[PDB]
Design a binder for this molecule. Structure first.
Ligand SMILES: COc1cc2c(c(OC)c1OC)[C@H](c1cc(Br)ccc1F)CC(=O)N2
Length: 127
């Protein structure tokens, strides 16, 4: 029934890098998805209290959202691009796990994911 604490976005002892791939993940990938007309349900953690989804965090054990990803990118939280790509994929997969096909939120996730895949296809080679 209750909400968990959000995912970690700060950890001073976690090793961090700023790489050209992570810069692309923020400037191209995150920015493109964030401005999309279907971005809004994904811009913050699922509030299972407000949304009256008391089973959400009984089913979704690795929550993820673009607000968290945005903070991780802006806080230089990641070591490599694959960590960040995994967060996006967790976010989409959580939606497909919890909801049913044809739900509005699933259609929204699919449109964002299509764009995500198109941008990741042109992830630059590591400098
Ligand atoms: C990522 O998972 C979700 C995030 C949000 C919402 C979700 O409910 C479908 C949701 O799926 C569990 C809410 C919402 C979205 C649509 Br579309 C229709 C009804 C809604 F209650 C609103 C929101 O701000 N975020």
């Amino acid at each position: 029934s209750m909400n968990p604490p959000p995912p970690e976005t700060s950890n001073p002892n976690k090793p961090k890098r700023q790489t050209n791939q992570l810069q692309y993940l923020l400037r191209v990938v995150l920015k493109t998805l964030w401005k999309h007309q279907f971005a809004w349900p994904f811009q913050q953690p699922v509030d299972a209290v407000k949304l009256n989804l008391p089973d959400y965090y009984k089913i979704i054990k690795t929550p993820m959202d673009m607000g968290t990803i945005k903070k991780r990118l802006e806080n230089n939280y990641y070591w490599n691009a694959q960590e960040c790509i995994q967060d996006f994929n967790t976010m989409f997969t959580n939606c497909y796990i919890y909801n049913k096909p044809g739900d509005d939120i699933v259609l929204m996730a699919e449109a964002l994911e299509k764009l995500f895949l198109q941008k990741i296809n042109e992830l630059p080679t590591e400098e």
